[PDB]
RNA sequence: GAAUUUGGACAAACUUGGUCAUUUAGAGGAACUAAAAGUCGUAACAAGGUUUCCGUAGGUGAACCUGCGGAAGGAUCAUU
RNA sequence: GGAUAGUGGCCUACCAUGGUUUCAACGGGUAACGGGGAAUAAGGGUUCGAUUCCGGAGAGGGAGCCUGAGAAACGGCUACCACAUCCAAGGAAGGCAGCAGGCGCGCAAAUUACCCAAUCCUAAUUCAGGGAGGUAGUGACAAUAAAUAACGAUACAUGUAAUUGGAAUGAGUACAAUGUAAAUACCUUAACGAGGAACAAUUGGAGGGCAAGUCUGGUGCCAGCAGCCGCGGUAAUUCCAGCUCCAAUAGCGUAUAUUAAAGUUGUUGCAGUUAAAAAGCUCGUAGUUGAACUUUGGGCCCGGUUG
RNA sequence: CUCUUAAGGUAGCCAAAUGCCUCGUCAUCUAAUUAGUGACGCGCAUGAAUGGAUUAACGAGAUUCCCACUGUCCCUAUCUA
């Protein structure tokens, strides 16, 4: 038969289900970065426990080695393109000493809002979801997008999606149309 | 075959095809709530002949036709149709009735199960048998 | 005995349901939920409490 | 009852069973 | 010396010590001499279809009361007789004599739970509809 | 050079018998467990009203009793 | 010596009594194909691996065999064993553990569809064939991303009320176009497609473990709840419901198996007076283990790597 | 709880070569069994050197069943002295 399609989790739940302190920080999270449920947290933090795991190995391993070396370099080069980690903290650490907000913070849903073109950051998720941000020439409909701290320069409205661009829209068009009956014609 | 027991019936307005969404009927189905009506679908349709089956696709009203995929939700009789708002039609109201009855015992207690499914199984077979 | 399976479930009277607006599921409920929890409105009751008396 | 006495009313309990054994054959 | 061989060369002592200690486990000995095959009724299953032949009322243990109203199953797998509580408030009703429902575990592996006794099986479906569902008024039990 | 055929080896398979393994019926007998608000006594926990317990033997409706040796986990760490 | 493709007690004639074994032979069991691997995973480990790759065996059970480079072949044959089709009763034809599909068994598993366009295979061979293979159907096995609303104004107290308004989108439906072998779907889309946005999110819970009610009505050791402890016998925070709220969330729960937890298998790393556990005592084979001691220290260089 | 003895049949065993009822009851053996065997036992009227129970081996001892075998028989016939 074909190959196997290779897939793997991205998330994992806590040890225990119903911690009052765990619980409390999610839910802060959860409220101060728009997000729709647990899911993206216990991703986000399944995600950096891979991050850790990888650096306290390298860690381990001998100071100048070549793999240290390079896979240390790589990461950290990774984090600091990715715009999680600070371009001062290459050191493999700072790494090791990272945070969930470091990596919150790099959602588009949290850029766009940074960068003002929404409200709130639920206004930012549903003009994100509504197909109205455009990284480049390409509309990016999805919270989480980990820009890479170069596309934050060029986070703007698309040509499509009415609010930076030539259409007027959907329900603005059947309000035109029906304001056109409302005049008397 | 033990327990397809095809379903013998009259179309009267509109047409069956094999694979159809079909509204089953009860003998005491209320069309007002929720009762012996079933979500299934017919499997074949089936012109009944001298014992051999001939598998049809079509039929228009005024037709006789068996059906396969059925009788293992409904009982003995009832109607299939596919609008909202249809009453089933008379219970066929026959001159005799089960008069002779008798107890059933199987003579090993181990085989019970087939004992009870048989006597379910012989309950949709004959239309008068109680 | 048997023969009394709904001594309490099935004769004693029962309130049908009531209707009530719905909850704003998903991302809305979160924010629900973050601003009855954490903008500190009127349910602290000393440290923390989530009903009434 | 006494471990010692449940012992010997085993015991007693299993020359039965060695004396019912030995009759059947 | 904590009473095993330190030795170099003990390998095979060591682990014919572990081999002899092991029986010990009653998950590693069940596992071993395949219980649950031979006995366990279920055939190292958690389902299994039977037939209903009794409803019996079963008094709880001390200090309990309210008897239980548990059904006894004639199993289609392989013919074992097993009493199989139905768990709901009431919902026997939903059950008939001489009824095809399915069993399961009843959350102990074994270990009759709760003040039930002798009882280690539960009902899960009767005559092919849910027993939950239809406690609960969204479908209905097919007529038989 | 077909059929047919002599002697061989390979051998399915059948009968009978033996042996082993696994399920399984069985009059009857003797156990265990659960539920107990059953009957009988009170055997143990206080020196539990005969201190308790072990091994062994015998006996008794039943717990148990008794002889023999042992232990204190005894009710004695104690008589220069 | 025969036979083999050749080696070989592979078989045969003579000869001697050899060969394995407590370092477990032989025998028994396996719900045993093995491995690359998988789950869990501080380390060490434990369990699984019928199933995408590699090797092996088999084609209802053996046995035998032609052809053929290659078969002990089975969509080849021979016969026996058990089934089993047809019959005009004389005969003839068999092996889906291929694709579908059907019965049975079940806890348990999809269409009697389309096509050689992709990948490759066979030939006499560019061309034909391929239920190999791919495509579609069924699919809450499992896995990824994340719709169910967002913003004003107004009224009131950063937030709340059936107080209202303008924007935004896809869930859909669908010309075309793309996608394809023709396709469906996926992406982009003319037009249609929001107002209790009914275009309405559920699964389990609210005594503890474990986040969330001494709310109300029912029930009165009844019905029932409860993985455990436990809750109900007229004040139930635990039952049945209503309201409110909690956890996860298009998923949640239930049952069994396994892993971590388990330092409750302990090599790392358990315990043995009283909780379970030192054999009544000694000898002793196997096994395991077992005192120290033999070239060290200077000095001179060549010369490496890190500040 | 009584009446009562010297003691009131203990361990064992049994419709037994010992049980009337009786062809006892159950099971097995057979198509069918007053037979046989295994059980049960308020056992007319079992029982401990008047020895109780069990016993390998042995027996021209009594009984039941099975294989084989055959004129015992179906069903008789023939031959020799
Ligand atoms: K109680
Ligand atoms: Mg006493
Ligand atoms: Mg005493
Ligand atoms: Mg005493
Ligand atoms: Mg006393
Ligand atoms: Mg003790
Ligand atoms: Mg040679
Ligand atoms: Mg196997
Ligand atoms: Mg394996
Ligand atoms: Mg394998
Ligand atoms: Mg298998
Ligand atoms: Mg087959
Ligand atoms: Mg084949
Ligand atoms: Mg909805
Ligand atoms: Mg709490
Ligand atoms: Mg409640
Ligand atoms: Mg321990
Ligand atoms: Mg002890
Ligand atoms: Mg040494
Ligand atoms: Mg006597
Ligand atoms: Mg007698
Ligand atoms: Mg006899
Ligand atoms: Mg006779
Ligand atoms: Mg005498």
Redesign the pocket.
Same mark, same amino acid.
């Given at each position: 038969?074909?190959?196997? %399609?290779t897939?793997?989790?991205?998330?994992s739940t806590p040890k225990?289900?119903?911690?009052?302190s765990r619980?409390d920080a999610?839910?802060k999270l959860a409220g101060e970065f728009g997000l729709?449920?647990?899911?993206?947290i216990? %991703?986000i933090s399944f995600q950096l426990s891979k991050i850790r795991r990888a650096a306290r190995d390298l860690l381990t391993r001998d100071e100048k080695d070549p793999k240290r070396l390079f896979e240390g370099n790589a990461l950290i080069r990774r984090l600091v393109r990715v715009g999680v980690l600070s371009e001062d903290k290459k050191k493999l650490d700072y790494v090791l000493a990272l945070k969930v907000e470091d990596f919150l913070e790099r959602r588009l849903q949290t850029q766009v809002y940074k960068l003002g073109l &929404?409200?709130?950051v639920?206004?930012a998720?549903?003009?994100?979801?509504?197909?109205?941000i455009a990284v480049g020439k390409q509309?990016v409909?999805?919270?989480?997008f980990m820009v890479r701290l170069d596309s934050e320069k060029h986070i703007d409205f698309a040509p499509?999606?009415?609010?930076g661009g030539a259409?007027?829209?959907?329900?603005?068009? %059947?309000? &035109?149309?029906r304001k056109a009956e409302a005049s008397g014609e | 075959?033990?327990?397809?027991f095809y379903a013998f019936g009259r179309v009267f307005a509109g047409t069956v095809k094999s694979g159809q969404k079909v509204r089953i009927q009860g003998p005491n189905y209320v069309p007002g709530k929720k009762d012996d009506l079933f979500i299934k679908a017919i499997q074949r349709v089936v012109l009944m002949m001298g014992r051999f089956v001939e598998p049809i696709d079509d039929c228009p009203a005024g037709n006789i036709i068996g059906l396969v995929g059925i009788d293992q939700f409904l009982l003995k009789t009832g109607t299939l149709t596919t609008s909202e708002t249809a009453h089933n039609m008379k219970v066929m109201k026959f001159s005799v009735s089960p008069v002779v009855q008798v107890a059933v015992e199987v003579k090993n207690a181990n085989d019970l199960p087939k004992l009870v499914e048989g006597l379910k199984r012989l309950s949709k077979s004959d239309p008068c048998v109680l | 005995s048997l023969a009394?399976?709904?001594?309490?479930?099935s004769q004693? *009277?029962?309130?049908?349901?009531?209707?009530?607006?719905?909850? *704003?599921?998903? !991302?809305?409920?979160?924010?629900?939920?973050y601003?009855?929890?954490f903008?500190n409105?009127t349910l602290v009751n000393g440290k !923390?409490?989530?009903? *009434?008396? | 009852?006494?471990?010692?006495?449940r012992?010997?009313?085993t015991?007693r309990?299993k020359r039965?069973?060695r004396?019912?054994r030995?009759?059947?054959? | 010396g904590?009473?095993?061989?330190?030795?170099?060369?003990?390998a095979?002592?060591?682990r014919?010590?572990?081999r002899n200690?092991?029986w @010990?486990?009653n998950?590693?000995k069940?596992?071993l001499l /395949?219980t649950?095959?031979?006995s366990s009724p279920?055939?190292?299953?958690?389902? @299994?279809?039977?037939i209903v032949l009794e409803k019996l009322?079963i008094?709880?243990?001390?200090? =309990?009361?309210?008897?239980?109203?548990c059904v006894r199953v004639q199993?289609?797998? =392989?013919g074992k007789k097993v009493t199989a509580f139905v768990? =709901?408030?009431?919902?026997?009703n939903f059950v008939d004599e001489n009824d095809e429902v399915?069993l @399961? /575990?009843?959350?102990?592996?074994?270990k009759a739970?709760?003040?039930?006794? /002798?009882v280690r099986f539960?009902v899960?479906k009767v005559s092919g509809v849910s027993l939950?569902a239809l406690?609960?008024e969204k479908k209905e039990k097919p007529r038989s």
């Amino acid at each position: 038969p074909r190959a196997p %399609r290779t897939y793997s989790k991205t998330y994992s739940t806590p040890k225990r289900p119903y911690e009052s302190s765990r619980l409390d920080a999610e839910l802060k999270l959860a409220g101060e970065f728009g997000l729709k449920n647990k899911k993206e947290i216990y %991703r986000i933090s399944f995600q950096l426990s891979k991050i850790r795991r990888a650096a306290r190995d390298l860690l381990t391993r001998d100071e100048k080695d070549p793999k240290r070396l390079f896979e240390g370099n790589a990461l950290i080069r990774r984090l600091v393109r990715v715009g999680v980690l600070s371009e001062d903290k290459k050191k493999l650490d700072y790494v090791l000493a990272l945070k969930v907000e470091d990596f919150l913070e790099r959602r588009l849903q949290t850029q766009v809002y940074k960068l003002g073109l &929404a409200k709130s950051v639920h206004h930012a998720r549903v003009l994100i979801t509504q197909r109205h941000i455009a990284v480049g020439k390409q509309i990016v409909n999805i919270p989480s997008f980990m820009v890479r701290l170069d596309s934050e320069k060029h986070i703007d409205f698309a040509p499509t999606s009415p609010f930076g661009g030539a259409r007027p829209g959907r329900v603005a068009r %059947r309000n &035109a149309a029906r304001k056109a009956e409302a005049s008397g014609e | 075959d033990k327990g397809r027991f095809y379903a013998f019936g009259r179309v009267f307005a509109g047409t069956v095809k094999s694979g159809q969404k079909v509204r089953i009927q009860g003998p005491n189905y209320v069309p007002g709530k929720k009762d012996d009506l079933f979500i299934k679908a017919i499997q074949r349709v089936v012109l009944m002949m001298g014992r051999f089956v001939e598998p049809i696709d079509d039929c228009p009203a005024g037709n006789i036709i068996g059906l396969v995929g059925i009788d293992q939700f409904l009982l003995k009789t009832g109607t299939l149709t596919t609008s909202e708002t249809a009453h089933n039609m008379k219970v066929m109201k026959f001159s005799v009735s089960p008069v002779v009855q008798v107890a059933v015992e199987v003579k090993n207690a181990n085989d019970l199960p087939k004992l009870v499914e048989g006597l379910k199984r012989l309950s949709k077979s004959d239309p008068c048998v109680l | 005995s048997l023969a009394r399976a709904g001594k309490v479930k099935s004769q004693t *009277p029962k309130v049908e349901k009531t209707e009530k607006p719905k909850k *704003p599921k998903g !991302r809305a409920y979160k924010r629900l939920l973050y601003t009855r929890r954490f903008v500190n409105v009127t349910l602290v009751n000393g440290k !923390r409490r989530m009903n *009434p008396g | 009852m006494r471990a010692k006495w449940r012992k010997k009313r085993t015991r007693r309990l299993k020359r039965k069973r060695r004396k019912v054994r030995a009759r059947s054959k | 010396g904590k009473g095993k061989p330190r030795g170099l060369n003990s390998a095979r002592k060591l682990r014919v010590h572990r081999r002899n200690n092991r029986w @010990a486990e009653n998950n590693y000995k069940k596992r071993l001499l /395949g219980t649950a095959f031979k006995s366990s009724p279920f055939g190292g299953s958690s389902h @299994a279809k039977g037939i209903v032949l009794e409803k019996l009322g079963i008094e709880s243990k001390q200090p =309990n009361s309210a008897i239980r109203k548990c059904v006894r199953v004639q199993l289609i797998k =392989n013919g074992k007789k097993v009493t199989a509580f139905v768990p =709901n408030d009431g919902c026997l009703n939903f059950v008939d004599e001489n009824d095809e429902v399915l069993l @399961a /575990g009843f959350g102990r592996k074994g270990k009759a739970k709760g003040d039930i006794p /002798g009882v280690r099986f539960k009902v899960v479906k009767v005559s092919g509809v849910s027993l939950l569902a239809l406690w609960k008024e969204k479908k209905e039990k097919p007529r038989s």
